[PDB]
From a paper:
Eventually, four pairs of BRIL mutants and three pairs of Flavodoxin mutants, together with their WT proteins, were crystallized and structure determined. The WT and disulfide engineered Flavodoxin structures were determined to high-resolution of 1.20–1.55 Å with B-factors in the range of 16.15–19.24 Å2. Based on our algorithm, the best-engineered constructs of BRIL and Flavodoxin show lower entropy and higher diffraction quality than the wild type proteins, and the predicted disulfide bond on GLP-1R facilitated crystallization of the GLP-1R transmembrane domain.
Previous studies showed that proper introduction of disulfide bonds could stabilize the flexible region of target proteins and reduce the conformational entropy by locking the protein into single desired conformation. Here we developed a comprehensive disulfide bond prediction algorithm that not just increased the success rate of predictions but also improved the quality of crystallized target proteins. The theoretical and experimental results both indicated that with relatively lower values of conformational entropy, proteins would be more stable and readily crystallized to higher diffraction resolution.
Residue numbers in the entry: 1 to 148
Write the structure that this text describes.
Amino acid sequence: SAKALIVYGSTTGNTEYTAETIARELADAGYEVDSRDAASVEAGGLFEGFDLVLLGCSTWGDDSIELQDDFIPLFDSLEETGAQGRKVACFGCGDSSWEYFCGAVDAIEEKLKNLGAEIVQDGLRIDGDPRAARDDIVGWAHDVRGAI
Ligand SMILES: Cc1cc2nc3c(=O)[nH]c(=O)nc-3n(C[C@H](O)[C@H](O)[C@H](O)COP(=O)(O)O)c2cc1C
C-alpha cells in the first residue's frame, strides 16, 4: 500500500518546493513516491496504481480564482483520473494579500469530493516563502500519513 503520487502545478517554484518537501517526508516513512510536474502529465488514468495521491497547485487570476496553468488540463479532466475511492489530499502556495487565499485548493477539493475521492486531510495552504513554512509542510505530510 506504499505507492504515492504527487502532482504539482507551480510557476515560481513555491508549490514545487512544497512538493519536494512532502515527497521526502513520505519517502522517509516508507512510501515509494512518484513526483511529477503537472506540465508533464496526462489526466487519463493518472491516479492508476497509487495508494495515495497528493495534488499541489498555486492560485492565480486577475479578478477571479484561477488555477496554475499547468494544472488546468488536469482539473478539467479530473473525472478521468481514477479518483473514485482514491485517498487524496491537496496543497498549494498562495499569498494572504488575496482574499481567496489558496483558493485553487478549495476548487480542487470540491471537485474531488464530487468525483468520489476520500479527502484524507484538509488542504495545506502556504503563505509566502514556503521555506518559512517547512515545519508546517512536514507536519502536514505526517498528518496525512496518520489519517490513511
Ligand atoms: C495575478 C496574481 C493573482 C494571484 N491570486 C492569488 C489568489 O487569489 N490567492 C492566493 O492565495 N494567491 C494568489 N496569488 C499569489 C500566488 O499564488 C503566489 O505567488 C504563489 O507563491 C505562487 O506559487 P507557485 O510558485 O507555486 O506558482 C496571485 C498572484 C498573482 C501574480
